Amino acid sequence: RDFNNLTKGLCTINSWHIYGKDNAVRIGEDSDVLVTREPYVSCDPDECRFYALSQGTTIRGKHSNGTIHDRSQYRALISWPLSSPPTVYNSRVECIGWSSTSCHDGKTRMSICISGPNNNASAVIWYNRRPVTEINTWARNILRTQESECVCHNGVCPVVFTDGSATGPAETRIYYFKEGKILKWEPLAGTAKHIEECSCYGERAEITCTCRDNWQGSNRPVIRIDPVAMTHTSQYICSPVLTDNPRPNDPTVGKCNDPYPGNNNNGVKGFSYLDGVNTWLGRTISIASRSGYEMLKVPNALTDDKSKPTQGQTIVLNTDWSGYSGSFMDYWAEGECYRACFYVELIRGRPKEDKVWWTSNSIVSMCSSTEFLGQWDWPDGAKIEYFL
Amino acid sequence: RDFNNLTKGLCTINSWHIYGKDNAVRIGEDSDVLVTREPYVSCDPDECRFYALSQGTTIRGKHSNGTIHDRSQYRALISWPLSSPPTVYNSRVECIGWSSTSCHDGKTRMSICISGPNNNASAVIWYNRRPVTEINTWARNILRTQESECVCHNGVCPVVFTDGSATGPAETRIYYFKEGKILKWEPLAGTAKHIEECSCYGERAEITCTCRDNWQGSNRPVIRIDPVAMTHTSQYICSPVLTDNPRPNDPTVGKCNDPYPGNNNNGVKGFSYLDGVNTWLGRTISIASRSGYEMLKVPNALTDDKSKPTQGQTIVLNTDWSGYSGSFMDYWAEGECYRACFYVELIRGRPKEDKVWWTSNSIVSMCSSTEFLGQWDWPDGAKIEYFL
Amino acid sequence: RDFNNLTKGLCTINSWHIYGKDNAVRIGEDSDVLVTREPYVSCDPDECRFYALSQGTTIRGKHSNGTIHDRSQYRALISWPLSSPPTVYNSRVECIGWSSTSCHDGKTRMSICISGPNNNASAVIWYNRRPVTEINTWARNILRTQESECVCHNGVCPVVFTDGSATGPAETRIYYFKEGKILKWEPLAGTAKHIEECSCYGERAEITCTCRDNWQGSNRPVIRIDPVAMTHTSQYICSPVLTDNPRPNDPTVGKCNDPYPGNNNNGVKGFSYLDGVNTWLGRTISIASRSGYEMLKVPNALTDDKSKPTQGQTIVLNTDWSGYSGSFMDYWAEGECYRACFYVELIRGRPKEDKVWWTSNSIVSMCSSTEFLGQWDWPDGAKIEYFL
Amino acid sequence: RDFNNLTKGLCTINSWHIYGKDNAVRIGEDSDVLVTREPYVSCDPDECRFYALSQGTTIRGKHSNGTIHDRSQYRALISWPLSSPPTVYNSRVECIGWSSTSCHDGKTRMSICISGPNNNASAVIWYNRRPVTEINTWARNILRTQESECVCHNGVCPVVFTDGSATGPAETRIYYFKEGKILKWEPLAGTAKHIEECSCYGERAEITCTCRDNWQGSNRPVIRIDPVAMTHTSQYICSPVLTDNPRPNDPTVGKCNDPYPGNNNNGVKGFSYLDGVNTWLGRTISIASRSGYEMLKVPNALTDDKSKPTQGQTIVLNTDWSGYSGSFMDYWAEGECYRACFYVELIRGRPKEDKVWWTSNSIVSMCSSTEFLGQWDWPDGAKIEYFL
Ligand SMILES: *[C@@H]1O[C@H](CO)[C@@H](O[C@@H]2O[C@H](CO)[C@@H](O[C@@H]3O[C@H](CO[C@H]4O[C@H](CO[C@H]5O[C@H](CO)[C@@H](O)[C@H](O)[C@@H]5O)[C@@H](O)[C@H](O[C@H]5O[C@H](CO)[C@@H](O)[C@H](O)[C@@H]5O)[C@@H]4O)[C@@H](O)[C@H](O[C@H]4O[C@H](CO)[C@@H](O)[C@H](O)[C@@H]4O[C@H]4O[C@H](CO)[C@@H](O)[C@H](O)[C@@H]4O[C@H]4O[C@H](CO)[C@@H](O)[C@H](O)[C@@H]4O)[C@@H]3O)[C@H](O)[C@H]2NC(C)=O)[C@H](O)[C@H]1NC(C)=O
Ligand SMILES: *[C@@H]1O[C@H](CO)[C@@H](O[C@@H]2O[C@H](CO)[C@@H](O[C@@H]3O[C@H](CO[C@H]4O[C@H](CO[C@H]5O[C@H](CO)[C@@H](O)[C@H](O)[C@@H]5O)[C@@H](O)[C@H](O[C@H]5O[C@H](CO)[C@@H](O)[C@H](O)[C@@H]5O)[C@@H]4O)[C@@H](O)[C@H](O[C@H]4O[C@H](CO)[C@@H](O)[C@H](O)[C@@H]4O[C@H]4O[C@H](CO)[C@@H](O)[C@H](O)[C@@H]4O[C@H]4O[C@H](CO)[C@@H](O)[C@H](O)[C@@H]4O)[C@@H]3O)[C@H](O)[C@H]2NC(C)=O)[C@H](O)[C@H]1NC(C)=O
Ligand SMILES: *[C@@H]1O[C@H](CO)[C@@H](O[C@@H]2O[C@H](CO)[C@@H](O[C@@H]3O[C@H](CO[C@H]4O[C@H](CO[C@H]5O[C@H](CO)[C@@H](O)[C@H](O)[C@@H]5O)[C@@H](O)[C@H](O[C@H]5O[C@H](CO)[C@@H](O)[C@H](O)[C@@H]5O)[C@@H]4O)[C@@H](O)[C@H](O[C@H]4O[C@H](CO)[C@@H](O)[C@H](O)[C@@H]4O[C@H]4O[C@H](CO)[C@@H](O)[C@H](O)[C@@H]4O[C@H]4O[C@H](CO)[C@@H](O)[C@H](O)[C@@H]4O)[C@@H]3O)[C@H](O)[C@H]2NC(C)=O)[C@H](O)[C@H]1NC(C)=O
Ligand SMILES: *[C@@H]1O[C@H](CO)[C@@H](O[C@@H]2O[C@H](CO)[C@@H](O[C@@H]3O[C@H](CO[C@H]4O[C@H](CO[C@H]5O[C@H](CO)[C@@H](O)[C@H](O)[C@@H]5O)[C@@H](O)[C@H](O[C@H]5O[C@H](CO)[C@@H](O)[C@H](O)[C@@H]5O)[C@@H]4O)[C@@H](O)[C@H](O[C@H]4O[C@H](CO)[C@@H](O)[C@H](O)[C@@H]4O[C@H]4O[C@H](CO)[C@@H](O)[C@H](O)[C@@H]4O[C@H]4O[C@H](CO)[C@@H](O)[C@H](O)[C@@H]4O)[C@@H]3O)[C@H](O)[C@H]2NC(C)=O)[C@H](O)[C@H]1NC(C)=O
Ligand SMILES: CCC(CC)O[C@@H]1C=C(C(=O)O)C[C@H](N)[C@H]1NC(C)=O
Ligand SMILES: CCC(CC)O[C@@H]1C=C(C(=O)O)C[C@H](N)[C@H]1NC(C)=O
Ligand SMILES: CCC(CC)O[C@@H]1C=C(C(=O)O)C[C@H](N)[C@H]1NC(C)=O
Ligand SMILES: [Ca+2]
Ligand SMILES: [Ca+2]
Ligand SMILES: [Ca+2]
Ligand SMILES: [Ca+2]
Ligand SMILES: [Ca+2]
C-alpha cells in the first residue's frame, strides 16, 4: 500500500443521496446498543465505518442515567460497520477517552483519543492499532479535538486541537502527524478568533476544515492546511448565510475576518464544502436549537460576503432533532473526483427530551450526486414514550 | 476474478430439496431479530446469503408496531449468513431504502436501494460497496424495483424498475448496468401490460424474468433479456395454470399476450423457471390469500396456452402463511448446469394475524434435484400467541 | 490442499484430558442460546468446531416448549466455535434437517442433513458449502445417519445410514462419497443385526465405527471400513463390558457375532477406540438411564469375549445426566500419531427433568493423554430450578 | 514468521497513559457479559487481546450466584478484543480450567489451563490452538500458574507453576516450553521462600517475573530467567516500598533475601518493572484491602534496601476497588524499545460488596509514556445498587 495523495477535486454537487443510517435509538429500545454521542464516519481503503464516543453502557441499561455528561472514564472511541448500530457485540474500541479523531493514511489508520480530568488531560495517538505518541495538555483546560475524521496527504495527517477556555481566547494548535509521530505543530494563525471541533476534507493537496467559534462567532471559522508545506491560514466563511447554532437571523452581509456577533459561548460542530460555485453549507434549520438540518448551495460562500443560496436540500425537518455534523469522503473510491459526504448526529434524550435520563444519538449520512435528486427527510425515528 | 458468463443451461428439475430456512420469527420471539419483509437470496462466488428489507427495529421491540407499512426512512437492504436469522448483530447493511435488488457479477456485487417520498424517490446504485450511480424518479410515483436478485452476464446486469401507477399503465424501464454505471436503458416493450417485482434467472446468455401484473393480469408477465444485445421481449405465461394471487380459478386456456382477467389491482411477487418441458411454476395454493405454496411442473407453460401440470411438489400447506417468492441460482457452483433455486417469504403478523401489531417474515428456500425426492411442508413455525 | 490420508496410528491412551466444554445450558439461562441435541465435534485443517442439531428456538424462548420432539421442520445442523455455546449470533447453519453427519476431507467439508416426514425423508449432501447430491428414502421409515463426524481417506468419506424399523431389521447402507458425489454404496454385511448412529474414527487407512443396536443388542455393533477398497465388515464388541444404555448387568462372557440380549428397542449413541491393548470403551455408568459417563480400558475388547477393564476414568458422575457420545480426532494435528477424542452430550430437561418444557444439552469433550492424569468429573452445571 | 527474540530494552517510563478499559460490569448490567476474574492482556504480532477466566455464566444470569468460588468445572480461559467486554458472543475459549497463562512466541500462541479437583489437577498445554502436552499435579494440592502472560525468547517460553500449600513451603517449578513441548523444568532456586502468580516481562534476553509470596512476605519475590541457558535466580524486591496486599506499613529498610514479615497467608497478584533507575512498582493504595492502585517510581528497588519513591501516578483511587495486576508488553510494536504495560483487575461484588451474590471484575490497562502526562483515576464505574 502507498500513502494516499489528495490528487482529485470534488465532484460537482447537484444534490445529496442517502449513504448510511443506523436507526440506533429505534433498534436499541430492545437490543444491546451502546449509548453514544459525537459520531462520525471514516473510510479505510476497503471499508467505511461509523465512529462515535461510547458512554460505556447500553441505552436500556441503568448506567444510561447521567449520559448527558461529556467526560467520564467510561467513554471510548468505537467504530462499527456502516449503517449497523453501535452494539456491545459489533463495536471495536479504537482508544479510550472523551474526545477523538481518526483517519486512514492509505497504509493504516491513525486514531487519537484524549482522556483525563479537565486540568490534566492527554492525547494518545494510535497508529496501526498501537499507541505511538502522547501529548500532554498545554493549557490545562480540557485538551480536545475534532470529533470527526482527519485527512492525510502523502502520510501527513494534520489534526486540530484546542486547549483552554471554551468562552474566550484559547490555545489552538495544528499538529502534523506521520505514522503517529509528530513532524511539526503550529499555533493557530489567521483571523479566526476561536476554534472548536473542526470538520475537514481534502482535495488537490489542500485540507479545508470548517470549525465552531464557540466564543463570539455565528459564522464558522475555516482553517485551510497545506499538508506538504505544513502551514495553514484561517478566516471565517464570509457568507451571510450563518451556519452555527444557536445563531441570529441571517443578515445581508457577513464577516470574512471577524465573528459575526449576536450569540456567545455556544455552538455546534458543523461543516461545509467550499469549492467556488460548488459550495454547499450545512446548518440546523432552527436558529435557537439543534433541530432540523439542511444543505444550502451558496456559491463562493467562503469569499463573498453577500453570497446567498441558489439551491438547497432538506435533510432533517425542523420538527426533528439534529446535532453535530461533519465531513468525510471515501478517498479510495473509483473515478475522477472525490464525492463529498457528511453525517448528522440525531441527538435523542437530554436535554431536550428529559423524560428519559439518558442522552444518545443515531446517525444519518449522505454523499453528493451529480444528479438533481428528489429529497426526503431523515429523522432518528425513535418514539421516546417507548423508553418510559 | 473474471465476470461471470451465463454459459450453462438449467439442470433437469425432477423435484426440490431444502436449501435454507432461517426460522426467524420463532427465534426472534426471544432474541434480537430485525423485522423484515421482501426477502431474497443471492450468491457471491464464495458464499450465498439471505437478503431482505429491514424495518429498523426488532420483532420484540416496541418499534415493531406499525411495520405493516412499506416505505419508511428506517428501512434498509440487509444481508446475513444463509439460514441464520436477520439479527441486529449479524446483519450487514447493503444500502438504505425500501425497495431493492442485488447481484454479483463475478468480480463484485451491485446493490440498488430506492428511497424517498412517493413523488420524489431515487435509486442509488452501489458497486463494490460504494455508491456509484443515482437515478431520479421519472414518473413521480413510487420508483421501485425487483425485490429479488438481478443477474449478470459478462459484467452487464439488467435490472427492471417501475415508476407510476400500481393499478394502471406505468413506466417500466430495463436498465443495463456495468460496474454500477448505466450502459443503456430501454422502456418496456412487448405485450406485458404492467410489470412489478420481477424475479429473474440466467441460462445460456439469456435472462428470464417472471413478474407481477398488479393491474389486470392473474397470469404472470415474462420479460426475456439478451444482456449482450441489451434488448428484451415481454409476454405472459400462456398456461392456464394461473400463478399470481389473488386470482380466479384456473381456466382450460390461458392468454399469451394479454392479462388473464378476473382480479384487478393486486398481486404477489412470484417466479417461474421456463425451460421447455423442464418448466416449473410456483404459486400460492389459495386463490384468495397468501397461503400455501406449491411448485407445478407445467411443460411449455410459457408458449402452450392449454399446458397443465404433469408433476408437482407442495412447499407450504394451505393452512400456513406464504408470501413473496423469487428465483436465484448459485452461478458459481461446480458442474455442468445451473441448479434452479427459489425462496418463499413466510409472512407473519399483519394483516392476516392482527393480534400482533407487527408484520414480519421468515424465509424458506429450496433448490432443484435430478432425483424424485419425497416432499415435506415448510411452515414458518412460530406460535403467534407467544407474542401476545 | 491435498486430501487427507489416514497415515498414522492412534496415540497411546493412558488417560483423558479436558478438550472443550461449552456450559451452554448454564449460559443460556440468560443469553440467546439455541436449543440443541445430537451434538458432536469435527475438525477442519485450521479449526475444530462444535456441531449439533438446533431446534430453531432459544432455551429461554417460548418455542423451547416441545423440544423433546426429534424431527421438526425447524431443525438444522449448526456449527460454532469450540467451547463457545451455540448462540443465535455465532452459530453457522451447515444444512437443514433432523439427522446429520459432517467431515472435512482435507480440501473442504462435506455435510449431510436429512429432512422430511417419516415416510418420505431425503438426504442432501453438501460439499464446499453447496448442495451436490440428494438421496431419497429407500425404506420409507425415517432415513437417518450418524449424528457424529464421518471420516475421509484420500477424498473418500464413508457414511453409514439406516432406513427402516428402529425395533427390528432395517436397511443399513454404507455410502462412499467423494466431493459430495456417490462413488458406491453397499448394504450392511457381517454379523451386526441392527445399526444406528455410528461413531467413527480413522487410523492406518481403516475406518472403525461403533454403533447402536437399537433392536436387541446391549453390546455395540462395530463396522470396519476399508475406504480404498470401499468394502466393510461388521461384528459386535466381544467384551462382556457392555456399553449401550439401557443394558443388563455385565456378564463374564460377551458375544462377538450376536446381540447380547436383555434389553430391546432402545439404546444410546456411543463410541469406542478399538486398538488391541490400547482399547478404551465409553459408557453410561447407569445401566438403566442416561446418567454418568466413564471410560474403561478394556484390552482387546473387540476380539476377546472375556476382556475386562484394566484402567478407567470417570467423566461424568452417576448423579449427573449424560447422553449421546461420539468420536472425533484432529487429523491435522502435529506429531506422529492421531490423538483419540470424544464428546458427551449432557442432556438437560425432558424427559428426566420435566419441570421444564424443553430438552437441550451442553457438551463436554476430552482427548487422550500419554500421561496418567488425574480425573475430575464434568457435569452440565445448570440449576434447573433457575428455569422455572 | 520467525520466533520473537527479546532484543530491545524497556522504554524510559516517565508516566503511564491509558491503553484499554472494558467497562465490563457497567455494560453487563444490561448485556450478555460473562462473569470473570483473573484477567490479563496479551499480544499477538497483529492484535492485542484481553484474557480472563470465565465462570461460565453471565453477570445478570442466575448462575452468577456463587461466583466468588475459584475452581469449578464451568471455568475457561477466554480472550476477546481489546477494550470490548467479555461477552457470550465475542469471547473465544482458549482452553478449559481455573488457572492459566498464555503467550505468543512470534509464530503462534501457547495457552495453558489447569483443571481438576484439588488433589488431582492437570495442566494442558495448547500450541497453535491444539493440545500438545499434559502435566499432572506433582504435589496434589492445587497445581496452579501465573494468571498473566508468559514470555518467549527464540521459541522458548518459560512458565512458573506452583503445587502445594498456599500457606507454607510448596513445590514451585519453572517449565521451559517450545512449540508446546517441555524442553526442561527446574525447581525454584534462590532466596524466594514462596511463589505464586508470577507477572513476567522480557527485555534484552532476560525474563523478569514479580510474584506473590502468599506465605510470609509482603515484599514481592522476583524470579529472573535466562531463557537461552534455561536457568533462573530468585530473590525479593529489596525496597522498603512494600507492594503485596494486605501488608504492614512501609519500613525504612526492606529485605532482599527474606520475606518482609507482618502479614501471613494472604496476598494479591502484582507486578513491577525492574530496570535500574527506570524502576516502577505497582501496588494497592490500601494496606488492608484490594482498594486503590498506584504506580511508584522506585529507583533500584530490586537491589537497594532503602529505595523510596521519586515519582508516582495514581491509577485507581483508594475509594474504588482494585484487584490483581500484571505485566504485558507488545513485543511486536515499532520502534527501538519495549513499552512497559500493565493491567488492573477491578473486582466487583463479593466479598467486599455482598449485597450481590456474584463476584466479577472489569479491566483497566495502561502503558508507559516518555512524556510526563497528567493523571486521572480509572474506576470500574458500575453502580452496585443497579444489580439489586
Ligand atoms: C422533489 O425534490 C426536489 C429536489 O430536492 C425539490 O426541489 C427542491 O425544492 C427545494 C424547496 O423549494 C429547493 O430548496 C430551496 O432552494 C432555494 C433556492 O432556490 C431558489 O432561489 C434561487 C436563487 O434565486 C435568486 O438568484 C437567481 C439567480 O441566481 C435569480 O434568478 C433569482 O431571481 C433570485 O435573486 C432560484 O434560482 C431558484 O429558482 C430555480 O429553482 C426553482 C425550484 O426550487 C425553480 O422553480 C426555478 O425555475 C429555478 O430553476 C429558487 O427560486 C433556497 O433559497 C431555499 O432555502 C431557503 O428557504 C428555506 C425554507 O424553504 C430555509 O430553510 C433556508 O434556510 C433558506 O431560507 C432562509 O435563508 C435565506 C438566506 O439567508 C433567507 O434569505 C431566507 O429568508 C431564510 O431565512 C430564514 O430561515 C433561516 C432558516 O431557518 C434562518 O436562519 C434565517 O434567520 C431566517 O429566519 C431552499 O433551500 C431546492 O433547491 C429544490 N431543488 C431543485 C433541484 O429544484 C422538489 O420541491 C421536490 N418536489 C416535490 C413535489 O416536493
Ligand atoms: C412422497 O413424496 C412424493 C414426491 O413429492 C409424493 O409424490 C407426489 O405426490 C404429489 C401429490 O399427489 C404429486 O403432485 C401432484 O401432481 C399432479 C400431476 O401428476 C398427475 O397428473 C399427471 C398428468 O396426468 C395427465 O397427463 C398424462 C400424460 O402426461 C396422462 O397420462 C394423464 O392421463 C392425464 O391427462 C400424471 O402423469 C400423474 O401420474 C403419474 O404420477 C402419479 C404419482 O403422482 C402416479 O400415480 C402415476 O402412475 C404416474 O406415474 C399424476 O396423475 C398435479 O396435477 C397435482 O397438482 C394439482 O392438484 C393439487 C392438489 O393436490 C393442486 O394444489 C394443484 O394446484 C393442482 O391442481 C389444481 O390445478 C390444476 C391445473 O389447473 C387443476 O386442473 C386442478 O383442478 C386444481 O385446481 C384447483 O386448485 C388450484 C389450487 O388451489 C386452484 O388455483 C384452481 O382454481 C382449482 O381450484 C400435484 O402437484 C407429485 O407429482 C408426486 N410426485 C412424484 C414424483 O410422484 C408422494 O405422494 C409422497 N408419498 C407419500 C406416501 O405421501
Ligand atoms: C487421581 O486420579 C487418578 C487417575 O484417574 C485416580 O486413579 C484412578 O482411580 C480409578 C478409580 O479407582 C481407576 O478406575 C478404575 O479402574 C479399575 C481397573 O483397575 C483395577 O483393576 C486392574 C485389573 O485388575 C485385574 O487384572 C490385573 C492384571 O491385568 C490383575 O493384576 C488383578 O489382580 C485383576 O484380576 C488392576 O490392575 C488395577 O490395579 C492397578 O491400579 C491401581 C489403581 O487404580 C493400583 O492401586 C494398583 O497397584 C495397580 O497398579 C486396579 O485394581 C476399573 O475396574 C474400575 O472400573 C470398575 O469400577 C467402577 C466403579 O469404581 C465401575 O463404574 C466400572 O464400570 C467398573 O466396574 C464395573 O464393571 C466391571 C466390569 O464388567 C465389573 O466387574 C464391576 O463389578 C462393575 O460392574 C458394575 O457396575 C457397572 C457400572 O455401573 C455395571 O454396568 C455392571 O452391571 C455392574 O453393576 C475403574 O475404572 C483408574 O484406573 C485409576 N487410574 C490410575 C492411572 O491409577 C486416583 O484415584 C485419583 N486420586 C484420588 C486421590 O482421588
Ligand atoms: C497533573 O498530573 C501530574 C502527573 O501525574 C501530577 O503530578 C504528580 O503529582 C503526584 C501527586 O503529588 C506525584 O506523585 C507522588 O510523587 C511522590 C514523589 O515525588 C516527591 O518526592 C520526590 C523525592 O523526594 C526526595 O528525594 C529527592 C531527590 O531524589 C530530594 O530532592 C527530596 O528532598 C526528597 O528526600 C521529589 O523529588 C518530588 O519533587 C519533584 O516533583 C514535585 C511534583 O510532585 C515538584 O513539586 C518538585 O519541584 C520536584 O520536581 C516530590 O516531592 C511520591 O512520594 C508520592 O507517593 C507517596 O505519597 C502517596 C500519597 O500521595 C502514597 O499513596 C504513596 O504510596 C507514597 O507515600 C507512601 O509511601 C511512601 C514510601 O514508603 C511513604 O514514605 C509515605 O509515608 C507513604 O506511606 C504511607 O501510605 C502508603 C500507601 O497507602 C502505605 O503503604 C504506608 O504504609 C504509609 O501508610 C506520589 O507518588 C507525581 O510524581 C507527580 N508527577 C509529576 C510528573 O510531577 C499533578 O499533581 C497533576 N496536577 C494537578 C493540578 O492535579
Ligand atoms: C469543552 C468545550 C467543548 C466545545 C465547545 O465542549 C463540547 C460541547 C458539546 C456540545 O456542545 O454538545 C459536547 C462535547 N462532547 C463537548 N466536548 C468535550 C470535550 O467535553
Ligand atoms: C428414529 C430412530 C432413531 C435411533 C434409534 O431415533 C433417535 C433416538 C434418539 C434418542 O434415543 O435419544 C434421538 C434421535 N434424534 C432419534 N433420531 C431421529 C432421526 O429421530
Ligand atoms: C490456591 C492458592 C492461590 C494463590 C494463593 O489462590 C488464588 C487466590 C485468589 C485470590 O487471592 O483472589 C484467587 C485465585 N483464583 C486463587 N487460585 C486458585 C487456583 O484457586
Ligand atoms: Ca458560535
Ligand atoms: Ca395480478
Ligand atoms: Ca441397544
Ligand atoms: Ca436480551
Ligand atoms: Ca503476602
DSSP labels, D279-324: -EEEE-S-SSSSEEEEEEE-TTTTT-TT---SEEEEEEEEEEE---
Q: What are phi and psi of C387, to 5 degrees?
A: -90, 0
Nearest chain D alpha carbon to A34? D27
Question: CA B185 to CA B174: how far, in whole Å?
Answer: 5
Which ligand is nearest the CA of A246, by number? 8
Output the CA–CA distances (angstroms, integers) from residue B100 to B39, B95, B159, B198, in the order listed.
Answer: 10, 9, 10, 11
> Any bridge partners for residue C363, and if so which?
C345
Residue D252 burial (CB count, 10 A):
8
One-letter identity of residue B12: T
Question: CA A98 to CA A269: how far, in whole Å?
Answer: 15
Ligand 5 binding pocket includes A166 (Cβ within 6 Å): yes
Angle at B114 between CA B111 and CA B119, to 5 degrees: 165
Known catalytic residue at B70: yes
* Distance (Å) from CA A309 to ligand 1 centroid: 7
- The full 3-state SS of chain C, as one line of letters, equals CCCCCCCCCECCCCEEEEEEECCHHHHHCCCCEEEEEEEEEEEECCEEEEEEEEEEEECCCHHHCCCCCCCCCCCEEEEEECCCCCECCCCEEEEECCEEEEEECCCCEEEEEEECCCCCCEEEEEECCEEEEEEECCCCCCCECCCCCCCCECCEEEEEEEEECCCCCEEEEEEEEECCEEEEEEECCCCCCCCCCCEEEEECCEEEEECCCCCCCCCCEEEEEECCCCEEEEEECCCCCCCCCCCCCCCCCCCCCCCCCCCCCCCCCCCEECCCCCCEEEECCCCCCCEEEEEEECCCCCCCCCCCCCEEEEEEEEEEECCCEEEECCCCCCCCCECCEEEEEEEEECCCCCCCCCEEEEEEEEEEECCCCCCCCCCCCCCHHHHC
Nearest CA-CA distance, residue B333 and chain A, Å: 27
* Residue the block writes with cell 470396519: C224
DSSP 8-state symbol, A387: G
Among the listed residues D43, D53, D56, B91, the one whose alpha carbon sits nearest the alpha carbon of residue A90 = B91
Among the listed residues D388, D325, D377, D322, the one whose alpha carbon sits nearest the alpha carbon of residue D352 = D322
Which residues from C are below 8 Å from B41, CB to CB?
none
Q: What is the CATH number of the domain that holds A21?
A: 2.120.10.10
Contacts of D353 (CB under 8 A, 6+ apart): D321, D384
Would the CA dihedral through B44, B49, B55, B57 be positive or negative?
negative
Question: CA A265 to CA A258: how far, in whole Å?
Answer: 15
Residue D46 burial (CB count, 10 A):
9
Nearest chain C alpha carbon to B87? C89
Experiment used for this model? X-ray
CA atoms within 13 A on the CB side of C360: 34
Among the listed residues A4, A2, A11, the one whose alpha carbon sits nearest the alpha carbon of residue A340 = A11
Question: CA D185 to CA B258: how far, in whole Å?
Answer: 88
Ligand 5 atom closest to A114 (CA): 19
Contacts of C205 (CB under 8 A, 6+ apart): C5, C6, C7, C153, C226, C227, C228
Contacts of C307 (CB under 8 A, 6+ apart): C238, C239, C240, C241, C254, C279, C298, C299, C300, C301
D92: Cα separation from own chain's centroid: 20
Contacts of D149 (CB under 8 A, 6+ apart): D40, D41, D42, D51, D101, D102, D103, D200, D326, D327, D328
Output the CA–CA distances (angstroms, integers) from residue C239 to A225, B79, C14, C275, C282, in the order listed.
Answer: 85, 54, 20, 13, 13
Direct distance between the N- and C-terminal alpha carbons of chain A, in angstroms, rounded to an integer = 51
Among the listed residues A44, A43, A42, the one whose alpha carbon sits nearest the alpha carbon of residue A1 = A44
Burial category of C347 from C-beta neighbours within 10 Å (exposed 0-12, middle 13-18, buried 19 and up): buried
Contact D30 A60 (CB under 8 A): yes
CB nearest to D90's CB, from A56, A89, A97: A89
One-letter identity of residue A262: G
Reading the block at residue D281, the C-alpha cell is: 512498582
Q: What are phi and psi of D116, to 5 degrees?
A: 120, 175
Among the listed residues D281, D155, D316, D137, the one whose alpha carbon sits nearest the alpha carbon of residue D208 = D281
Reading the block at residue D351, the C-alpha cell is: 466479598
Contacts of A160 (CB under 8 A, 6+ apart): A145, A146, A172, A173, A174, A175, A195, A198, A200, A209, A211, A223
Which residues from C are below 8 Å from B372, CB to CB?
136
Contact B19 C132 (CB under 8 A): no
Binding-site entries of D for substrate: 37, 71, 196-197, 212, 290
Q: In 3-state terms, what secondary structure has residue D63?
A: helix
Would the CA dihedral through D230, D234, D238, D244 be positive or negative?
positive
What resolution, expressed in A, was reported for this entry?
1.8
* Distance (Å) from CA D183 to ligand 7 centroid: 28
Which residues from C are below 8 Å from B47, CB to CB?
129
Would the CA dihedral through A359, A362, A368, A371 be positive or negative?
negative
Q: Is A284 on the interface with D (CB under 8 A)?
A: no
Contact A377 B73 (CB under 8 A): yes
Direct distance between the N- and C-terminal alpha carbons of chain C, in angstroms, rounded to an integer = 51
Question: CA A68 to CA A57: how far, in whole Å?
Answer: 13
Q: In 3-state terms, what secondary structure has residue D246?
A: coil
Question: CA D284 to CA D314: how far, in whole Å?
Answer: 10
Residue D253 burial (CB count, 10 A):
12
Contacts of B86 (CB under 8 A, 6+ apart): B22, B24, B33, B34, B36, B50, B52, B54, B78, B80
A179: Cα separation from own chain's centroid: 23
Q: Is A336 on the interface with B (CB under 8 A)?
A: no
Output the CA–CA distances (angstroms, integers) from residue C158 to B334, C49, C212, C213, D200, in the order listed.
Answer: 21, 21, 17, 19, 50
Q: In 3-state terms, what secondary structure has residue A80?
A: strand
Minimum CA distance residue for ligand 1 atom 2: A374
Ligand 4 binding pocket includes A120 (Cβ within 6 Å): yes
Q: Is C85 on the interface with B (CB under 8 A)?
A: no
Question: CA C169 to CA D109: how far, in whole Å?
Answer: 51
Contact C87 D91 (CB under 8 A): no
Which residues from A are below 8 Å from D82, CB to CB?
93
Q: In 3-state terms, what secondary structure has residue D205?
A: coil
Is there a cis peptide before residue B351, judged by omega within 30 degrees of 0? yes
Q: In 3-state terms, what secondary structure has residue B59?
A: coil
Contact B137 A82 (CB under 8 A): no
Output the CA–CA distances (angstroms, integers) from residue C231 to A279, C225, C276, C378, in the order listed.
Answer: 78, 6, 22, 38
The number of helix segments (H) and strand segments (E) in chain A equals: 1, 23
Contact A376 B73 (CB under 8 A): yes
Among the listed residues B63, B43, B31, the one whose alpha carbon sits nearest the alpha carbon of residue B202 = B43
Among the listed residues A234, A321, A324, the one whose alpha carbon sits nearest the alpha carbon of residue A274 = A234
CA atoms within 13 A on the CB side of C2: 5
Ligand 4 binding pocket includes D262 (Cβ within 6 Å): no
> Any bridge partners for residue C209, and if so which?
C200, C223
DSSP labels, B264-288: -S------EE--TTS-EEEE-S-SS
Nearest CA-CA distance, residue A124 and chain D, Å: 7
Question: CA C72 to CA D369: how far, in whole Å?
Answer: 60
Minimum CA distance residue for ligand 1 atom 88: A249
Ligand 2 binding pocket includes B377 (Cβ within 6 Å): no
One-letter identity of residue C353: E
Query: Which is catalytic among the residues B32, B44, B70, B226?
Result: B70
* Residue the block writes with cell 410456483: B282
What is the strand order of the sheet A221-226 is part of? Answer: A199-203, A206-210, A221-226, A231-236
Contacts of B107 (CB under 8 A, 6+ apart): B1, B2, B3, B155
Ligand 4 binding pocket includes D374 (Cβ within 6 Å): yes
- The full 3-state SS of B26-56, as one line of letters, equals HHHCCCCEEEEEEEEEEEECCEEEEEEEEEE
DSSP H or E segment with residue A27: helix A24-28
What is the strand order of the sheet C130-136 is part of? Answer: C99-104, C109-115, C122-127, C130-136
Which domain does D23 fall in, by range? 1-388
Minimum CA distance residue for ligand 2 atom 82: B285
Question: CA D6 to CA D156: how far, in whole Å?
Answer: 11
The number of helix segments (H) and strand segments (E) in chain B equals: 1, 23
Reading the block at residue C244, the C-alpha cell is: 449401550
Minimum CA distance residue for ligand 6 atom 15: C70
CB nearest to D18's CB, from A62, A96, A120: A96
Catalytic annotation, residues of D: 70, 324
Question: CA A366 to CA A295: how far, in whole Å?
Answer: 11
Residue C44 burial (CB count, 10 A):
16
Neighbouring subunits of D (3+ Cβ pairs under 8 A):
A, C
Direct distance between the N- and C-terminal alpha carbons of chain D, in angstroms, rounded to an integer = 51
CB D307 within 8 A of CB D336: no
* Distance (Å) from CA C172 to ligand 4 centroid: 81
Contact D76 C375 (CB under 8 A): no
Contacts of C354 (CB under 8 A, 6+ apart): none
The bridge status of strand A272-273 relative to strand A280-283 is antiparallel
Q: What are phi and psi of C170, to 5 degrees?
A: -140, 175
The bridge status of strand A122-127 relative to strand A109-115 is antiparallel
CB C33 within 8 A of CB C387: no
Ligand 6 binding pocket includes C99 (Cβ within 6 Å): yes
Q: In 3-state terms, what secondary structure has residue D135?
A: strand
Known catalytic residue at C70: yes
The number of helix segments (H) and strand segments (E) in chain D equals: 1, 23
Nearest CA-CA distance, residue C31 and chain D, Å: 6
Please count the structural domains in chain D.
Answer: 1
Q: What are phi and psi of B254, to 5 degrees?
A: -95, -160
Direct distance between the N- and C-terminal alpha carbons of chain B, in angstroms, rounded to an integer = 51
CB A3 within 8 A of CB A107: yes
DSSP 8-state symbol, A144: B
Q: Is C290 annotated as a binding residue?
A: yes
* Residue the block writes with cell 458512554: A55
Ligand 6 atom closest to C268 (CA): 11
Query: Which is catalytic among the residues C176, C273, C324, C343?
Result: C324
Which alpha helices (DSSP H) does chain B contain, by range? 24-28
What is the rounded radius of gyration, in angstroms, for the C-alpha atoms of chain C? 19
CB C213 within 8 A of CB C268: no
CB D280 within 8 A of CB D270: no
